[PDB]
Amino acid sequence: IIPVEEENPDFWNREAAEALGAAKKLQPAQTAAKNLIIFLGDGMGVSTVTAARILKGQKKDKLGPEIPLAMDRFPYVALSKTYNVDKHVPDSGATATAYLCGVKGNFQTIGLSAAARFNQCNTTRGNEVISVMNRAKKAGKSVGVVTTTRVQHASPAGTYAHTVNRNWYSDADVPASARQEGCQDIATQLISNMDIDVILGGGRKYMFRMGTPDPEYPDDYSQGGTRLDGKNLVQEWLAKRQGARYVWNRTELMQASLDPSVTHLMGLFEPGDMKYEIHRDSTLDPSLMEMTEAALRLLSRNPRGFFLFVEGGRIDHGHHESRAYRALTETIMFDDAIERAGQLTSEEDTLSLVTADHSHVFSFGGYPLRGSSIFGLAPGKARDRKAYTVLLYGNGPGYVLKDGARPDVTESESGSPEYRQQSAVPLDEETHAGEDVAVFARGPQAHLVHGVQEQTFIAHVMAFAACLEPYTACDLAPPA
Amino acid sequence: IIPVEEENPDFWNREAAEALGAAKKLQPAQTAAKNLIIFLGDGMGVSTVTAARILKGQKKDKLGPEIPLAMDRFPYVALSKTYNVDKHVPDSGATATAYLCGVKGNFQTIGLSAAARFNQCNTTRGNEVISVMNRAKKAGKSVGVVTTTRVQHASPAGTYAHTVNRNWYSDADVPASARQEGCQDIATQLISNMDIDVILGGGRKYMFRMGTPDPEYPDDYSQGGTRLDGKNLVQEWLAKRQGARYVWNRTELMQASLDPSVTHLMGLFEPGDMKYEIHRDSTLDPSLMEMTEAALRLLSRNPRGFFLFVEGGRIDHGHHESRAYRALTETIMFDDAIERAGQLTSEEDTLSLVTADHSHVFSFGGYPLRGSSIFGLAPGKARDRKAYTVLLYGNGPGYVLKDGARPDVTESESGSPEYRQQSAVPLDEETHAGEDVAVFARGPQAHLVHGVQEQTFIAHVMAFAACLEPYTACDLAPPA
Ligand SMILES: *[C@@H]1O[C@H](CO)[C@@H](O)[C@H](O)[C@H]1NC(C)=O
Ligand SMILES: *[C@@H]1O[C@H](CO)[C@@H](O)[C@H](O)[C@H]1NC(C)=O
Ligand SMILES: *[C@@H]1O[C@H](CO)[C@@H](O)[C@H](O)[C@H]1NC(C)=O
Ligand SMILES: *[C@@H]1O[C@H](CO)[C@@H](O)[C@H](O)[C@H]1NC(C)=O
Ligand SMILES: [Ca+2]
Ligand SMILES: [Ca+2]
Ligand SMILES: [Mg+2]
Ligand SMILES: [Mg+2]
Ligand SMILES: [Zn+2]
Ligand SMILES: [Zn+2]
Ligand SMILES: [Zn+2]
Ligand SMILES: [Zn+2]
């Protein structure tokens, strides 16, 4: 559909004139950031962002691509180079080390330099690299970890842990030799490595001993505690903090977030990862947006400021399933959380960065008409005279041969929330992609986010902006 | 391979400290641009840029992803939204209208507002939108069009033409009704619409009448002239310009580019598009880099400055064939041309933008090791126990079923210049992609290139920077 208003060149000339005016008004801050927020869209590459924008635009009353995402409104953009030291196409652990600790590492390790080796406990020590969140805490700021995955998953773990193996969620996962050598599981590291004021997401199970019924699924044993060392880490965490509260559901989160004197809040809302937003029980579970507001309620009380990590952690998972519907709906909720944080904080004193850890082999093609669904079919048949989707994957589990050929697909099918887009190569899981991802930035020192940078730049600019870390001699005036 | 130096966190800390220093030194110009250069990588999306960087890095003596492209060194980056008014995934014609005329248009039209309709000659008039190159010429600047495609192809045509149909290369292509209605073929528009000082690329055939032997392929009739109206457009062009010279080979280009008193230069080096760089006859044909130097030699003589359009036009073509080897080698040559222009011009007075018209359904995945060839196989077999490549396409002509299944592939095969990477969907041509592309910018007013913008922004910032177009009342000091 051709929007009549866009047929007039003045429509475009007006918009661009407005764009130039706004571009010209941009000025660098001379003041430091009181607060730091990194929003991490896990797997949210450039193709995911554009596709998400179109979907969200249509979710509203619009044609799609012309409607900005909240992240699109951020003034400063850079491209981030995501390679790990040992692999061109990275994982979440070693990219976390880069954008949270400012040092690149090897695939599947977290918070360690590339002198460490994956799954070799005895290469750990000396190679720990401290996150900017850790450094923010050392400087007196409150710190928060918020994600739709397990809080012990690779991305949030980058804020606090150091491990040669991202799979070491609880002691149950650590080989005896590594346990003997003192490599702690991530759940333990979560409560021991540093003080964290707010911890919100999934991952209940790793905190409790085997036999412990999950409170929300007391009749599904696979959801119960996993630990073999007898520890209740929630209880240990509560015991070492006054003002500490633990919640596992939305209503309790709500009460806690408004309760003055709740100073430490741990909200673990599923046994493992939180449900996709489309499957979320809105009585039992907070959305990402709700969790980030809950975090902000508590974190904003500290006069010295805060560091907050907010992850759209299941964007990635949607893409791995090659279910773009799940990837993009997670991305919209991620964008809503970004929008909400923007409503609850000031860019005068808060440096906010939105980025992705890496991308996916996700593409948006065919030649679909303006206003068409992102989940629709490309106009015109493929060379095999069957339809195909505008959304596709390079590889992954949507590769199908139905009696010896690529199957036709219909609009109703292509539009289903369970639909897996086709790929060129069958894999149980679609693969990450190695191309540059965006960094969006607003707030004090956001103008420093520019050009094409190593992913490590994200950690360093945030540390610099807040006068942390090796930049205590930033030469910045106090936050506005 | 793990580079030993990168195992030390100070490697990363040093680099990022250096990055912050450079970021902090960036200052906006208060002066206008004397010169304007747009480098257009046709089809050169974010995945193409990263893949190209890795290849080029290894072409040198390096592991790949850590080595900047010339374009990577540009300080300012924005994301450009490429949708056409009528289609989410655009073509080269209507994106040209956006980044060259500052107005979005409909798919397969050039230099027309979206009030025009494709292939409807009688919707043309009133809807012409004038390019910033045209406006630069009106302001006394010299102007140059340089590309590896036909100079009448959609992208260069955006600098000078206005047509409802990009396929109208010569009069031979225009229906009688449209000819009767006065819609001129692009080759005619090339010589008639405006004065152009330098025209370098392919497209000899459309300039000469049928029967005219091509000078370089006098024994292949399909390469001869196409025109039915009896016109020799080269002769007509030469006749209306003193100092005018026409060349069809590299040695003549060389002589002309150093010949003072050659004031107008038309170099048409193939009948149609120029050969891929890997197939270029270096005695007969100039590379893109060589052509852009030739252009700069002539254009730089004007004291009022110049506008130059330089296109890596066959990046796109490589991707359409799903031959990433051709796409990426074109991208490297495009980057070399950017590097060369940077050597021959000053960022004190030259605004240079590098961008793409749109992307492709090209992805870079698997989990390949550091230092591995971009054309190599992903480590580990696919779910069908056969190898797969790190480079893949969503759709296109690399979709193969060899006796009823996805064929295995070897390293020697994957690395061949003729190799087509696999896709999910068979198409004669791989399809453009609709995700945002990068804009890289350096020079006076380059800092205005920021955030997420409509593609039209590219035209407007360039016009603004040079105080052209509707921005004669820019409020800028004279060029430095
Ligand atoms: C780590 O332990 C393994 C297993 O015994 C051993 O082979 C290796 O040498 C150790 N490396 C270090 C750094 O001690
Ligand atoms: C939420 O958690 C509390 C325990 O803290 C429990 O009493 C309440 O029943 C829970 N709500 C639901 C709906 O399960
Ligand atoms: C263009 O010409 C066609 C063919 O005769 C006609 O149907 C149509 O109405 C014309 N449109 C305009 C704008 O004159
Ligand atoms: C280049 O063009 C000129 C005509 O301008 C011709 O005399 C010369 O032979 C050409 N060179 C080659 C190698 O064909
Ligand atoms: Ca729950
Ligand atoms: Ca030639
Ligand atoms: Mg994650
Ligand atoms: Mg082109
Ligand atoms: Zn990830
Ligand atoms: Zn992942
Ligand atoms: Zn194109
Ligand atoms: Zn194309």
From Swiss-Prot, chains A, B:
It is an enzyme of class 3 (hydrolase). The keyword Translocase does not apply. Its cofactor is Mg(2+); Zn(2+); Ca(2+). It is a lipid-anchor; GPI-anchor. The keyword Aminoacyl-tRNA synthetase does not apply. Residues 412-424 have a biased composition (Polar residues). Ca(2+) binds at E216, F269, E270, D285. GO terms for molecular function: alkaline phosphatase activity; magnesium ion binding; zinc ion binding. Glycans are attached at N122, N249. Mg(2+) binds at D42, S155, E311. SUPFAM superfamilies: Alkaline phosphatase-like. Pfam families: Alk_phosphatase. GO terms for cellular component: cell surface; plasma membrane; side of membrane. This is Alkaline phosphatase, placental type. The gene is ALPP.
